[PDB]
């Protein structure tokens, strides 16, 4: 019942914390990979085309992918890449934290 | 009137990607008012103490910047939440 769900949730969150790798010891590439850039652009374009608040100033453009590229140029994309290690461990890099090319 | 703490799994809209608390409230919690629920066991008379869980476990719970997991094929985000419901 409620307590069974409580212990299930506790086990799930404990496993999640045991899998997360803290910011002070991640050993992945500092750069943003091409796949990461493409998916971050696609997801940000989806979000803005779904009537999300925007930060950069529109120059009359109406292509959501172009607006997402403008945001990536201005480093205004509020997204996090969760790079998954083979065993399930994950490092949460930020878009601004990564260096594009 | 019994206070029943529950854990939700709700969707977050890109329109509400800037005030996720009010987004979750208006998407899910506000409809539940004055409507009987097949899970809790009574008509919900209100809510309070809505706290959104974090997709990053190492983040301190006192922080104000939490992570929501975006659907791979949709700009919507799904996250776990905790909230107390006033149930009659």
């Amino acid at each position: 019942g409620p307590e069974d769900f409580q212990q299930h949730e506790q086990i799930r969150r404990k496993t999640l914390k045991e899998k997360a790798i803290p910011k002070d010891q991640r050993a992945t590439t500092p750069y943003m990979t091409k796949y990461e850039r493409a998916r971050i652009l696609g997801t940000r374009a989806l979000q803005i085309s779904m009537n999300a608040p925007v930060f950069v100033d529109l120059e009359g453009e109406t292509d959501p992918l172009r607006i997402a590229m403008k945001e990536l140029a201005e480093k205004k994309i509020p997204l996090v890449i969760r790079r998954y290690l083979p065993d399930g461990s994950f490092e949460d890099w930020s878009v601004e934290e990564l260096i594009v090319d | 009137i019994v206070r029943v703490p529950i854990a939700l799994y709700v969707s977050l809209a890109p329109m509400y990607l800037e005030n996720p608390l009010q987004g979750v409230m208006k998407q899910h919690l506000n409809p539940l008012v004055m409507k009987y629920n097949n899970k809790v066991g009574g008509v919900v008379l209100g809510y309070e103490g809505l706290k959104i869980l974090d997709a990053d476990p190492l983040s301190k719970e006192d922080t104000s910047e939490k992570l929501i997991k975006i659907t791979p094929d949709t700009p919507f985000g799904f996250t776990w939440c905790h909230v107390n419901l006033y149930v009659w």
């Binding site: 409620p2 | 939700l8 899910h28 809790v40």
Partner: peptide, 18 residues
């Protein structure tokens, strides 16, 4: 209705009604 936009995916009781 009943899309994943008005109703939660799962409602789980955290603890007994208190």
């Amino acid at each position: 209705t009943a899309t994943t936009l008005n109703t939660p995916v799962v409602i789980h009781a955290t603890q007994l009604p208190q």
